[PDB]
Design a protein around this ligand. Structure first.
Ligand SMILES: COc1ccc(C2CNC(=O)NC2)cc1O[C@H]1C[C@@H]2CC[C@H]1C2
Ligand SMILES: [Mg+2]
Ligand SMILES: [Zn+2]
Length: 347
């Protein structure tokens, strides 16, 4: 009511506590944060989007997130939108992106996990589900997210791109598809390697601002930005990071319950008690999260240094929390089950 207003003061900040805004948004945080973001950037008045169309689309979209799914619910999407919005404001990117590219980035973030069933691509592939058979086992969920994101523009009072030029809409579409498909975890290595290649040949003005003359460079940054935002959990204050960890473990273990229930024998998951939560977060940072953010900190040198420090501290905290009292860890002592990182990896 009025507590929402105070929390939305941290809008342009990394330290925004999205869990608090969830409680004061009447369990509707994505529409809430998206309305906030779009006003702070004057996007509604720029692209001729009325309150009616926007709210209606966001309400429709947010409702297509699963509220019973532990991690991949609308709050995660709210979190990714807000984080993306911060990253767009990064000094090294000031005046670089056009309004259509800004619109594309935040919108992509909003839809990037819509209609997520709380199971991995591989689970859908192993079960011979409709979605796997439609998308040819190829970025199954990420394709679906985009499909749903754009189909919902067709519902009543939902076309927020109504008043865009045929050209602008085509360009927006191309960018959005590109950014969201980039969120495929099996494409992480491929994407990081090219980002490194882009840093190795970076061009800047004397003030520090990056120079990205043509679309190919501009789109590559946005890909990695939304991808960083998606993988930003470990870079947040440990007050939030631990909540996200709790949530992802609940969803992942719930997938493990499904697999047993259905008697799947393709690479079985180790059940909740035998898993090593803390070492997994460490491996997660070491092999995936830190390499990507380190490369990002290079690109926006040195705007993301504070973010990078926070990450390193969080890594050392989870490392210190690894109990040596069962050695080796239980998941390594079972030749049948697979540990958290083992099952997730192999990308
Ligand atoms: C807070 O940690 C996570 C936050 C978000 C994710 C997402 C990333 N993208 C996905 O599409 N799915 C999982 C994973 C996280 O960690 C888990 C992965 C490793 C195995 C257990 C830990 C470590
Ligand atoms: Mg995802
Ligand atoms: Zn996501």
């Amino acid at each position: 009511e009025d507590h929402l207003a105070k929390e939305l003061e941290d809008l342009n900040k990394w330290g925004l506590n999205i869990f608090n805004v969830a409680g004061y948004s009447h369990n509707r945080p994505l529409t809430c944060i998206m309305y906030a973001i779009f006003q702070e950037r004057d996007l509604l008045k720029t692209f001729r989007i009325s309150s009616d169309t926007f709210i209606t689309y966001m309400m429709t979209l947010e409702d297509h997130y699963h509220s019973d799914v532990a991690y991949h619910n609308s709050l995660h999407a709210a979190d990714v939108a807000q984080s993306t919005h911060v990253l767009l404001s990064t000094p090294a990117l000031d005046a670089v992106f056009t309004d259509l590219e800004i619109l594309a980035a935040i919108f992509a973030a909003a839809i990037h996990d819509v209609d997520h069933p709380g199971v991995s691509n591989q689970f859908l592939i192993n079960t011979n589900s409709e979605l796997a058979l439609m998308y040819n086992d190829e970025s199954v969920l990420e394709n679906h997210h985009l499909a749903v994101g754009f189909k919902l523009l067709q519902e009543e009072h939902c076309d927020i791109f109504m008043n865009l030029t045929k050209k602008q809409r085509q360009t927006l579409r191309k960018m959005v598809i590109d950014m969201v498909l980039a969120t495929d975890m099996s494409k992480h290595m491929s994407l990081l390697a090219d980002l490194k290649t882009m840093v190795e040949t970076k061009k800047v003005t004397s003030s520090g601002v990056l120079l990205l003359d043509n679309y190919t460079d501009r789109i590559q940054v946005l890909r990695n930005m939304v991808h960083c935002a998606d993988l930003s959990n470990p870079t947040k204050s440990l007050e939030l990071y631990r909540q996200w960890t709790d949530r992802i473990m609940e969803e992942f273990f719930q997938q493990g319950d499904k697999e047993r229930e259905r008697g799947m024998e393709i690479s079985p998951m180790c059940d909740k008690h035998t898993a090593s939560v803390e070492k997994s977060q460490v491996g997660f940072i070491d092999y995936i999260v830190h390499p990507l953010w380190e490369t990002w900190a290079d690109l926006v040198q040195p705007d993301a240094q504070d973010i990078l420090d926070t990450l390193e501290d969080n890594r050392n905290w989870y490392q210190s929390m690894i109990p040596q009292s069962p050695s080796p860890p239980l998941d390594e002592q079972n030749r049948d089950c697979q540990g958290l990182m083992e099952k997730f990896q192999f990308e």
